[PDB]
């Protein structure tokens, strides 16, 4: 082996909880979507959903209005919109 990898590149005791501070400042990261190609060939305000056809539509139905509500919009509709 060549020591060039050891010079400047360089069971453990680290934990996955140590990356909590670093996870609170980086934007949404995708699996097979490169971020460099986004600003290079796509629009900055373009909505992106990775593999939308993998699972069916996850939603719930209200009891009073019966509106199909997204998971993130459940609490907002029940307060001042139901």
């Amino acid at each position: 082996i060549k020591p060039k990898v050891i010079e400047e590149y360089s069971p453990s005791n680290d934990s996955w909880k140590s990356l909590m501070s670093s996870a609170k400042d980086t934007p949404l990261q995708y699996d097979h979507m490169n971020r460099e190609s986004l600003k290079k060939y796509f629009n900055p305000n373009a909505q992106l959903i990775e593999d939308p056809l993998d699972k069916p539509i996850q939603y719930r139905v209200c009891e009073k209005c019966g509106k199909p509500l997204a998971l993130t919009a459940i609490v907002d509709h029940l307060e001042n919109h139901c």
Partner: protein, 445 residues
């Protein structure tokens, strides 16, 4: 049966709140992790430190990670007793003593709303069996065969579903009238197909309001006469942009509506003069769709290559400054920015000398996956699309019928007729005369 090991920990409140708090943080880490440290911290084993040696599971209580191929994380449960591991590839929970994932508990699947979990079980409900996909036809009230086909692809459009189910328009609309705004009428249709009207003439009331609204702006597109389907597409998507600027609280070229943020692209034109090859003045023109000719062609790549094929201007007055001579430059169209969903229109019509027109009934080959690396303006990586919608027309240039073909989650295709909804194989739709195509973003390398 339900996993009894995860049911035993459910008996305690603080223990159940503790495991539900860490998975929401664990899933928040995987969504905001750099790919470099992702393999070194979330996909690196603790015993052999092999990268992606099977399913790498992160520990629930500590920072140990073990591989699947050598039972390194399984030994962590056989020695310490941690049988609940989260796979860094999908974020699911696996049980070792049950040898199976936990995919029958909506609590862990909706752990992001665990703080209000007591309310969702009372005021909300799960969708029904027959209305879990919204598969329902639209009764043809006349010559509306072209209208119902355009709405069918928008019903199963994942970008339109997320925008409609989020209640963005309803919470920001000023008039909130279904018989006046197009967005308010579309929300009634998705509520009639995906939900249930409180409390067979069923699942068809919301479609009537769309005819009433369209009659107030343009009575010609009210379905009473046979019209073009592509003209109806650009008509309805423009009114959604007009209703968004109306709901604004108070200058910018690019809009923030659901159409401008999804289907809006930009073209690039170059006029290459053969004098010094320093041309030209770049002009960027946005677009929403692409019209491609199919004359003397058989594949989808052949029609797209002709669009990117260079052409020489023969009726263009030109005066260059590089070579300083009147020359016939070369015109070339390039793609500057690609939209998330690419729609392609095929000109299945030709012009004759006597003024009449003829429909092009030549079959055009098209694959389920389309690579767009050979049509970029400014090497390039691999960019792949996926076909999700096919609109087929059968008839003449002034008389025919429209039948749409759309695919839903799971890779299952369907035949979307006026009042006949039925399944169909994947190889059958690849042989029909496709008039409109729908390609969404899948993967960028």
């Amino acid at each position: 049966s339900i996993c009894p090991h995860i049911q035993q920990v459910f008996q305690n409140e603080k223990s159940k709140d503790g495991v539900l708090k860490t998975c929401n943080a664990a899933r928040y880490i995987l969504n905001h992790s750099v790919p470099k440290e992702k393999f070194l911290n979330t996909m690196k084993c603790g015993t052999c430190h092999e990268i992606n040696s099977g399913a790498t599971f992160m520990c629930l209580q500590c920072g140990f990670c073990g591989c699947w191929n050598h039972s390194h994380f399984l030994s962590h449960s056989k020695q310490i007793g941690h049988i609940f591991g989260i796979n860094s590839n999908n974020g699911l929970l696996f049980c070792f003593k049950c040898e199976d994932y936990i995919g029958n508990i909506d609590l862990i699947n909706d752990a992001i709303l665990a703080k209000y979990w007591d309310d969702v079980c009372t005021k909300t409900m799960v969708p029904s069996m027959e209305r879990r996909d919204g598969l329902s036809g639209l009764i043809n009230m006349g010559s509306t065969c072209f209208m119902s086909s355009i709405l069918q692809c928008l019903i199963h459009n994942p970008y339109f579903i997320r925008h409609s189910m989020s209640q963005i328009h309803s919470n920001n609309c000023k008039v909130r009238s279904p018989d006046k705004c197009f967005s308010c009428a579309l929300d009634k249709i998705v509520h009639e197909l995906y939900g249930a009207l409180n409390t067979s003439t069923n699942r068809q009331t919301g479609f009537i309001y769309l005819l009433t609204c369209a009659w107030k702006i343009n009575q010609n597109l009210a379905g009473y006469s046979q019209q073009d389907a592509h003209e109806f597409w650009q008509f309805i998507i423009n009114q959604i942009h007009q209703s968004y600027v109306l709901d604004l609280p108070n200058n910018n070229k690019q809009c923030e509506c659901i159409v401008h943020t999804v289907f809006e692209g930009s073209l690039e034109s170059s006029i290459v003069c053969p004098g010094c090859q320093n041309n030209s003045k770049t002009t960027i023109d946005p677009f929403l769709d692409l019209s491609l000719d199919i004359k003397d062609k058989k594949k989808l790549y052949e029609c797209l290559d002709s669009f990117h094929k260079k052409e020489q201007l023969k009726d263009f007055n030109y005066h260059c400054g590089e070579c300083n001579s009147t020359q016939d430059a070369i015109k070339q169209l390039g793609i500057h920015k690609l939209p998330s969903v690419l729609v392609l229109q095929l000109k299945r019509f030709e012009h004759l000398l006597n003024g009449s027109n003829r429909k092009l009934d030549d079959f055009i080959e098209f694959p389920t996956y389309l690579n767009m690396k050979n049509y970029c303006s400014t090497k390039v990586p691999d960019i792949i699309y996926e076909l999700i919608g096919i609109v087929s027309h059968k008839g003449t240039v002034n008389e025919g019928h429209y039948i749409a073909f759309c695919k839903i989650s799971g890779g299952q295709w369907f035949k979307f007729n006026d009042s006949m909804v039925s399944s169909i194989s994947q190889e059958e739709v690849l042989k029909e005369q496709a008039y409109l195509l729908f390609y969404t973003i899948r993967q960028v390398n």
